[PDB]
Design a protein around this ligand. Structure first.
Ligand SMILES: O=C(O)CNC(=O)C(=O)O
Ligand code: NI
Ligand SMILES: [Zn+2]
Lengths: 5, 348
């Protein structure tokens, strides 16, 4: 899981 | 009472106030800064995160996105298409080139107009979501890599790492690159520093009005709403200030300049665009006040591996008296968006 734009 | 107008506030700390991050966030909340959903913090002139930015030209942007935008009448959808990797050096040349450069303008309103007029033409490239920090390992004040907030309990206790959330992200912008309306993952706070370059303009909706924006967006995109409750978390939805105004959504705007911090607050909706070539560093953080937001955050269902933080450690540590009830699904607590974080006892 990661931050996405 | 405190910022009854709920306008975006700007703060000018001394180096001594700059020293303790959590404390200053508590302070600006005691001044009502959180009601706008967004605030600006200008660091003291003496403070610099790094000495010089020219030793970075070989830094790699692994996954640039071309931002394609479709829509009309102030309602748009953004499709981010991934491109082959490039360096900062290569990005600057494309950004400052005659095809993607900032057009001529007198005042900010004109540039804003050109953004909302032209955002569907000549799709730009955004250097987003780049893992890394441009800080220097010895800068102890407002270091986006280590802020020492309670969010750390995700890594330090539960051993989980979530890129861009408890680690830093870099964003290399050019003209017309944008970020759609959203709150943070788990409705956390975020911090954003513009390291160098052209400005970044922001729009914000007060948390106390956030639900009105959601209903508005649901009305415009019912198909998207049926597929996912939280579809705004997809960060595809662009809505102009004219439409917000037309439909009676309160909002404010602010432009961030190189060397300035922006703070977004739990369940603050924000959106914006970059004026030209620039570099911003960002991460999420938390305070005690966030815990209740985290517990209540409505999350994206429709996509795999979205950011979901277990609230258990937080409830267990900071709300032991409510833990048993919360685990049972009986915690009925209502959030008052106007209230400051408890850490501000002294300031008030
Ligand atoms: O800088 C960007 O493109 C977007 N940043 C944010 O949404 C933030 O810092 O909260
Ligand atoms: Ni954000
Ligand atoms: Zn979804």
């Amino acid at each position: 899981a990661r931050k996405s734009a | 009472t405190l910022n009854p107008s709920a306008r975006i506030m700007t703060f000018y700390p001394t180096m001594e106030e700059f020293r303790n991050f959590s404390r200053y966030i508590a302070y600006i909340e005691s001044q009502g800064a959180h009601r706008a959903g967004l605030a600006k913090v200008v660091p003291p002139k003496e403070w610099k995160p790094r000495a010089s930015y020219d030793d970075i030209d070989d830094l790699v942007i692994p996954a640039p996105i071309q931002q394609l935008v479709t829509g009309q009448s102030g309602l748009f959808t953004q499709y981010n298409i991934q491109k082959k990797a490039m360096t900062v050096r290569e990005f600057r040349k494309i950004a400052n080139s005659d095809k993607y450069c900032t057009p001529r303008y007198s005042e900010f309103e004109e540039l804003e107009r050109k953004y909302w007029k032209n955002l569907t033409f000549n799709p730009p490239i955004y250097g987003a979501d780049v893992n890394g920090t441009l800080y220097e390992k010895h800068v102890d004040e407002w270091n986006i890599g280590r802020l020492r907030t309670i969010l750390d309990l995700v890594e330090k206790e539960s051993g989980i790492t979530i890129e861009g959330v408890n680690t830093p992200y870099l964003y290399f912008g050019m003209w017309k690159t944008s970020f759609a309306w959203h709150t943070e993952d788990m409705d956390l706070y975020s911090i954003n520093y513009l390291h160098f370059g052209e400005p970044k303009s922001w729009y914000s909706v007060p948390p106390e009005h956030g639900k009105r924006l959601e209903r508005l967006a649901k009305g415009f995109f019912p198909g998207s709403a049926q597929s996912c409750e939280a579809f705004l978390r997809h960060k595809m939805t662009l809505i102009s200030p004219l439409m917000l105004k037309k439909y009676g959504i309160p909002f404010d705007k602010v432009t961030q300049e190189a060397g300035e911090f922006m703070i977004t607050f739990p369940y603050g909706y924000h959106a914006g665009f970059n004026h030209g070539f620039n570099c911003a560093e960002s991460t999420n953080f938390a305070t005690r006040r966030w815990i209740e937001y985290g517990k209540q955050a409505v999350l994206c269902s429709c996509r795999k591996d979205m950011v979901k933080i277990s609230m258990d450690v937080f409830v267990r540590k900071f709300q032991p008296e409510r833990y048993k009830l919360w685990k049972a699904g009986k915690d009925n607590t209502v959030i008052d968006h106007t209230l400051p974080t408890p850490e501000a006892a002294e300031f008030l």
